[PDB]
């Protein structure tokens, strides 16, 4: 009946009963024969009496309904459609056996293909994920004219990290900030996956009711670009000073990688033709990112194999493998991202970088021995496995253990610091936010504080690539040990 | 003069002629002056006299030269339905070797073709349907795909044809049937057009300029065809062709080859659609090929992990391998596998005889540095291997020890033994002056001779799977000693 902080995790944001006022909406039966529903502003916007029950040809003219019926062969995006009286940008789709027609007054626009080609040409030569992600916020802001453009990337736990930002010089920075998974509820994530673009013209605009809200059953606006916005998010945006937004969904391995989020501090909406271009840019961006990400993964795997092969050849001419490992173990830190590495062999410890103290190591080795079946064991939350590890979480909150034997509890141990310790936040800790009725929950400062609490005593998770490199290292050492036993 | 003795280095990029389905003007780098023109420019464009030493503005007019200069500030630019006298020409424009080349032909599809391949979810399904679709859409008598082999031979892997034509499906041609300069131009250009294999070539005037420079037609679509290739097509009864280059990992994977038994050239708009289809085909093939490779590697890892878990509760690893070795044949394509341990042989499928294994095991022990050793030409390494080439022409050897010459051996048959050729051995061909050489029958016979006593090469993927198997066995052996 009324959304608040206790139920916003389940708000039915796909059936709000309202649209935003920058266009009007007509809902027809699946044949587009009769008008079933309309937004209240259809009269004003299109120049029409009482719309429900009239035929589509009566309301819109036979010529337009004919062209629209043809188009029904993603919603169809049809700029500069000639109405019976003027030009309208029309979005047309069928869902839940309902035809939804969305109208915006047409302006003067370039062909979307040409706008998109200009943008795509300025990222297509990026040859690292870093270079693509940093340039894209600057390019999008320059092309679309928003006050702020950010990219955020979803973390393994569903949190967002802001990884790129272009902004007006007077704004606060969010670069290197995180927000908790709960800042974007599951239904919003489902709709970001389904729709390339999400448009908010005015976070404080009066909603326009869909007549009727409930029929003789609510209207499913999942694919309607005019669909109204959650009061919770509108309040969040108002607290930030944001009045408008457009997000471009980033799809990698068929899932929602993150968003290109465009924010404006005054009501703002892009023409349909520029939105078509943005959608084409989004598709290209996603594919180029996926290709760069794959090449980065391949290069990091090949780097590890090259290093471990050098180690195999080195060890072949060494009578004392323990001594070689005591002299060499620091070099293994270069296989994967870590803040420390150590060697635990025959109840003797050797450490490099950020590691637990020497006295803490026996408890860690005993735990891994009990917990693993002679393969790699890794956690990003040590205190959860070993309460005692809380004391040294600042230095080492995460551990990946590579067994050196199936008959002795000897390990190569990799460590990561508590994630808050490696923050590179460009933001202003003295920047404060106004609130509304829901209070300070709906502010970036509180979002960030909630995130910090969700990852307290935790490190950056060990990725599938980190685990693949650990397995390669485990195997290379089995091989060093076996050939050593063969030849001695 | 080209013949079979020098066609391997024919300078086909500077032939001094064009095909008759358009005309060509060569200007300086700034498109100021006409330097060369095809002899048919007068007839096609309604121009009189020697065009050389006339300004581009004179010959083309102020509007066209302005438009072409603008197109130049941007692959060759394709400008369909340009206004000349108010006539319409499809214009191709490019710059190469400080020369502007302008090509003229008297004057939707891509989305429809791409939509019919985009849902293919195997390389087999994509390449099977593509010949059918291209034939139906572009209206050629035959459409084939061939894929280049590691030695540069072509294998015909897909075919759509008129029911009255002979089949080339499963046929190979040797690397020499496509010379190195032809391969370079197939890599550089998405499309290669032959409007008429019996068309009279049109000279470029002059062929060699006052400075002694030929005109480099590397990027010109009207570039004329080697007399060697025209004779080959005339022997087949082919009169016209268009190829779409297939690019995988930035290299020439093969061609989509469209053949017509009468003259044929597609309009520039349809060619632009075919090029867009070719780019999509290449990217979709690359994606499907990667997926197949990943699935094959993961399949091998899953099997080897099952072998590792199985081995952990076995006291006698030699016995488990004697009982299990035949399953290792499922890791990579092979016709046979066997286990050579403590000088005892266990074989499955097509292998050399019992008597032959010591010599092979001896050779690998001497040849390898304790890692995987593989050849597809056993007789080259070991002359007496010729005797059993029919059964086993290729061998991949996985060491089971660095102190004992114990091996897991994989074998492949002589490649001619695994042939699946759909052609007619009684179909014969007319020949011209160069003779028998320029016929599909002779090309196939030459290929067979180049691969005699050889198997299918062990791929980079086969070798990665062999390395995984070598390592899994090291792990079995080590954990066994750890607990025994
Ligand atoms: C219980 C429900 C809540 C909720 C719902 C919604 N959030 C939606 C969008 C959204 N929210 C944010 C969060 C931010 N946290 C920050 O710290 C921060 C900036 C510093 C932001 C912007 C983000 C990032 C987004 C994504 C859109 C964008 O990036 O612009 C949302 C959907 C809105 C829509 O219909 O378009 C809903 C619903 N937000 C909460 O905080 C809670 C409590
Ligand atoms: C010494 C030079 C030779 C030579 C030159 C050229 N070949 C070119 C193209 C070409 N040749 C073939 C060969 C085939 N072998 C078959 O068995 C067979 C059919 C069953 C064919 C068609 C192929 C496949 C091609 C590629 C084009 C296509 O697939 O249609 C060539 C380039 C021509 C150009 O400029 O377009 C040159 C030059 N061919 C020889 O046989 C030798 C001796
Ligand atoms: Cl507005
Ligand atoms: Cl990434």
Residue numbers in the entry:
A (entry chain B): 6 to 53, 55 to 79, 86 to 97, 99 to 229, 232 to 503
B (entry chain A): 7 to 80, 86 to 95, 97 to 119, 127 to 503
Paper excerpt:
In this work, we employed an approach to disentangle noncovalent and hydrogen-bonding electric field changes during the reaction cascade of a multidomain protein, i.e., the phytochrome Agp2. Agp2 originates from Agrobacterium fabrum and carries a biliverdin (BV) chromophore. Phytochromes harbor a methine-bridged tetrapyrrole chromophore as a light-sensing unit, which upon light absorption undergoes a photoisomerization at the terminal methine bridge followed by a cascade of structural relaxations.18−21 This reaction sequence interconverts the parent states Pr and Pfr and involves proton translocation, which has been shown to be a prerequisite for the functional secondary structure transition of the tongue, a phytochrome-specific peptide segment. In the present work, we have generated two further variants with ortho-cyanophenylalanine (oCNF) at positions 165 or 192.
We determined the crystal structures of the Pfr state of Y165oCNF and F192oCNF variants with 1.90 and 2.06 Å resolution, respectively. Despite this minor difference, the BV chromophore structure remained unaffected by the Y165oCNF substitution, showing nearly perfect alignment with the WT Agp2-PCM. The region between 1500 and 1700 cm–1 is dominated by the C=C stretching modes of the methine bridges between pyrrole rings, which are particularly sensitive toward geometrical changes of the tetrapyrrole skeleton.54 In the Pfr state, a nearly perfect agreement between the WT and F192oCNF spectra in this region underpins the preservation of the chromophore structure in both proteins. This conclusion is largely valid also for Y165oCNF, although the stretching of the C–D methine bridge (C–D) displays a 4 cm–1 upshift, which suggests a slightly larger dihedral angle and thus stronger torsion of ring D than in the WT. Minor differences that do not affect the functional integrity include a slightly higher torsion of ring D and an increased keto content in the Pr state of Y165oCNF and the reaction kinetics. Interactions of the nitrile group in Y165oCNF seem to be more variable because the ortho position of the CN label allows for different, possibly coexisting rotamers. Our crystal structure of Y165oCNF in the Pfr state shows that H-bonding differs from that of the WT Agp2-PCM, as the nitrile group is pointing away from the potential H-bonding donors propC and H278 and no H-bonds are found except for a hydrogen bridge of the Y165oCNF backbone. Again, this finding is qualitatively in line with the nitrile stretching frequencies that are in each substate of Y165oCNF distinctly lower than in the Y165pCNF variant.
